[PDB]
C-alpha cells in the first residue's frame, strides 16, 4: 500500500495503481517517458503523466487495433501505421504470413529508441527485416512518398487531447491525403479513444460520424481494457465491404496469423461490433465531423 | 478539486470520485450505509465502503439483472429477490406487465427503509401493491413456504467463505433449496461478480461452473459499469432452453415492458451473452465449485 | 476510509484528512469558502481549497496570535485586527479584561458573516459589544482613521502567495503606516507563516528581518499545529522591551484574561520562543528585507 | 507530478511525499524493508510501511536520541542500543570522544546489514573500532551478561501490547532487567512516540510514566521532525540528577563531540525540555503503567 502512480482519467475521476519501481526515466523535446513497474498492471508506459499501455493488458488493445482490418482484406501486403511507437502495433502486424512491409512513422524517435530498448515483448518486431522507423510527422509522410498501402493504422492519440494528431482525423485528411494513399481496396482502421456509455461522445462518436462523410463502409468497435479505465474503441473503414462471419474470420486467423491470439477470436469481434442500444442510437445521432 | 471518495477496488488499485457532498453515513450491525454526492456519477449509494450502485449508471446493472431472464420466460408473474434493498431490481421487475407479485427478501431492514426514503427513483416501485419486502434471511424464507416463483433473482453481495451471503451460492443450496422452488420453466438469474479479462476469476467463473452442475441452460452475460471499473457479470440458469435471437427479445420488450430500457436491446444482450475468448474459455475449464 | 480532503501544503507534499461530511459551502467575489467536517481534526474552514483553521487546534494558533503581545503590555485597551474574519482572533483579544476596543479589519465580508453563521465557538465574541467588524483593505483602514492602537494583529495571509497582503509585510509599511498607528509603547505581533526548520526559511525568516529594520525589540516564537502539518510562526515587535519571566506572565494571565488558556502558560512562551539552533541562526544570517 | 509515497499516520490521516524512485524493497519474516527516493525528505527508509528516517531530517531524531543523555553524563564510556538497526543512533554515539565501546544489539540482521550497505551517511559508523554489532533480543541479551553500560539507549518500535518491543518499556524490564545494567551514575534514554498536543497520549506520556515508577529523575522532552508530520518525544532517566543549564550543555558539546551539532544546542535542549501546559499536566496526571 506505499508507493502509488496516480492519474486523472478526467477531472473528477482518479485511476491509482501501486508501484513496484519506477523503472526507467526518458524525455524527449516532445514529452516525459516513463517505464513503471505496477502491481495491478506490470510494466506500464506513461507518457507526460498519461498511460499509454501497460503489460498485462496492451495485447487486448493491440489485438484489436489490428488483427480485423487485415482480416477483412482478401491479402494484405504493406501496411503504414500513423504513429505507433511502442513497437507492439508492428509486432501484431508482423504475425501476419501475407505481410511483407510495416512502415512505422510517429514524431518522437526518443520513445521509439526508449521502446526498442526497454519493451522487451517487441524486441523481435523491432528487429524484423519487413519493419522500417520512419521519424516524421505522418501527414507529412504520407503526402511526401507515392507508394500506397492495402492497410492504413491510425495509432496516434486521441484528436480533442491537442493540436498535432487532431488534423489527422479531419474529413479532409481522410478525404485528400488518406485515401489517396489506400489501393484498390485498402482498409483504414483508427483508435477512436474511449467508447463507454458516457465516454464514447467525446471523440469516438464524431470519429465514427467523420469517417462516415468519406468511406462507403464504418464498422465501429469496442473492448474493455482494464488498465485504460474504460471501453475502448476502434474504427474500420473501406469503399469495400466489411462482412464476415465469426466462422470466416477464425478459418482465416488460423491459415493467415502466426501463432494463436491471446484475446481475439470471430466471435469476440462479433461482439465487439455490436455496441451497446444507446452507444448504437447515439452514433446515428451524431453530427460533428471534424473539418 | 479537494474532496474524494476513494474505493481499493483491490488492494494495488484506487478508483477515486470527486465529491460535491456526503449526504448521510451511518451502519446496520450488518454494515455501514452512506449515500454521497459525486461528481462523476451522482448520487452513490456505498456499503461498507463499497460502492453499490451510482445514479448516472445503476440502470445498466439493474436492466441486465433483470430483463434477459423475464424476457427468456414465457410469461413471469411472480418473482423473488434474494437481496436487492435499493429498490432497484424491484422497481425494473415491476415495468414488466406480466408481473402479478414481487417479493423482495433482505437481510438489512435499515438498508431497505434508508432507499425507500433516500433513493427517490425506487419511490414508485416501493410503493406498488404488487411489492412485498421481507425482512429475512433467504434461504430460510424460500425453506420455509411451499409458494413458487416463476423467475427468482440474486442480488447479493459476492460470495465470500465465511460470510453470510456464501451459502446462497452453494451446489446444495441450488439444488436442494431453490430449484424446488422455481416453477415449471422457471429461469434463475445472479449477479456474478467482475467479469473482466482477469477478474472474472475471482467469482465469476466459479458461479458459472457452480450452477452448470445443478440446470440444464446457463448463460453468462456481462456488461461495463463505468462506476464500478470493469466489466460486471450475470448468470441466467433454467432447465428450459435460454435461446432468443435478438429480435425475438426486442419484440417481447415492446409487448411487456413499459416504456423503452435505457441500456438494453435484443443486440446487447447478444452481444453480451459472447464472451470474449479468454473467458469463454476460462469459463469452460473451471472446476471450482461452490459447497454446503 | 471512504472520503477524503486532500491539500498540497507544498508541490511535493499532500495531507490529507478523512471526511464526515461537507458540511457548508458559499463563495465570495474573493474565493471559494468551505466548512468541512474532519474526522481527525473537527471543522475545518478552507479558503480557496487552504485550510484556514480547525477546530481542534486553532486555540493553539489563536492563544499563541494574541496573548504574548498583549501579556508584555502594561495596559493594552484599543486593539486593531488586519485580516481575522473568523472570529477567533477578536474571542481571545476579548477574554482581555483590559480591552475596551477590538477592530477587526477584513476585506471579505462573506467569510466574515459565514463565520458568524457557522463557527460556534465564536458566537459570544462576535456579539461582544467591544467588537467593530470593517470591511476594508487594513492598509487603506489604518491609513483613512487617526485612532492609534495599543496593539496591533497582523493575521492575513502569507506574504510570498499572492499580492493583497504582501504589501502588508514591506519596511516600508511598517515604518510609514503601522507605527504611526501605535500608541507610545504599543506592541505589534504577525502571525509569520510556517517555522520548520527548513520551512522557515520561505517568510518566517524575512518577516523576522524586515521588522528586526522597524522596531527596537522583536521576539520571534513558535508553536505546533497539527492541522497546519507544521511548525506555525509569530513575531512580537516593540519599541519597549519585550522581556518578561514565565513567572510574571503567569501571573499576568491570572490577572488579566478571563477563563483558563488551554495551550498557553509562561513556560509555553518561553518555550516557544527558544528557537532551535538551525533556525536562530538562519534568522540571524536572514538579509532579505520585503521592501 | 504523478508518483506517491502515502503513509496513514492515523487511520484518518494521510501524509504523501513525491517519490522520484524505488530505489530498494524487500522483507525479513519481521517486516518488509524499503527505502525511496522522495523529493521533499530524500532517501526514505521504510519498515513494513511506515517511515523510519528520511535522509534531510534524520540528524533531528538522532542527536535529540543521543546527545542529552551522554552530554547530562560525566564521562560516558560504553552505551548499549535497544534496536537501532539504521546506523544512525550509533553514529552520533560514536561523535562522542569520551566512547570506547558502543553495542547495537538488533533483532533484524537483514535490516542492519541493508543500512550498512545503503545508508552511506553511517558506513564511517558501520565501520568504527568501537561498535560491535549484536543479533538478540535485547532484553535476553543484557540479562545474560553481567556487563553493565553508563548510557543505555532505546531505539525500538514504540510499544503496542503484544507485539515484540513491548516488553521493553515494562515497569518490570526497566527495575529488574535493565537498571541492574547501568553503572553509576547510568543515563537511560528512549524515543517515546509522538509527543503531539494530542497524539502524545498514546505511548508518550505512558513511557513518561512508567519510567517515573523506576528512577528518581524523568526528563520527558520534543522536537519537531518534518518527515513524521509530528513533534516526537523521547524521555531521559537515571538516578543521579539530570539538571544541566543551556551554557554547560554548550561547553561539554565543545568538549565531547566531533564537528558541530546540526540540531541541538542547550538552548535547544532546554526548550525541547519544556513541554508545553496540556502536554505537562497530561505527563502529570497520567497513571497507565506498562506491565510484565
Ligand atoms: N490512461 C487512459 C487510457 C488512455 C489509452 N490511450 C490509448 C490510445 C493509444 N495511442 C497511442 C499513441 C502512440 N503514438
Ligand atoms: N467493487 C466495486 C463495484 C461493486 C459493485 N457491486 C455490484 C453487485 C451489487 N450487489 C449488492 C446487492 C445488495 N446487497
Ligand atoms: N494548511 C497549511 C496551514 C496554513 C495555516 N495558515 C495560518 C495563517 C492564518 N491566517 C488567516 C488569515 C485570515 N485573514
Ligand atoms: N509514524 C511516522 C513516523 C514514525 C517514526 N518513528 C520514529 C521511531 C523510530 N524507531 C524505530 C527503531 C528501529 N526499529
Ligand atoms: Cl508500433
Ligand atoms: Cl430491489
Ligand atoms: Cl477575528
Ligand atoms: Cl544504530
Redesign the interface.
Known sequence: ???????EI?????????????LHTGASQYQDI?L?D???FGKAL?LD?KLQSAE??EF?YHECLVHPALLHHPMPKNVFIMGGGEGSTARELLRHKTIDKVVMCDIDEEVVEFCKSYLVVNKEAFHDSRLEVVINDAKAELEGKEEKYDVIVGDLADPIEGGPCYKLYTKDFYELTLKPKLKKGGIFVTQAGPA????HTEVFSCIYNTLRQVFKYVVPYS??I?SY???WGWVLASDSPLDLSAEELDIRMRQRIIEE?????G??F??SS?????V?NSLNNETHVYT
Open positions: 500500500k506505499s508507493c502509488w502512480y496516480e492519474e478526467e477531472e473528477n475521476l482518479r485511476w491509482c495503481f501501486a508501484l513496484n519501481s519506477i516513463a513503471l505496477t502491481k495491478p506513461v503523466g498485462t493488458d487486448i463507454g456509455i458516457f465516454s473492448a474493455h482494464p479505465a474504460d471501453i491470439n491471446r484475446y481475439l477470436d466471435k469476440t462479433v461482439s455490436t455496441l451497446s442500444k444507446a448504437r
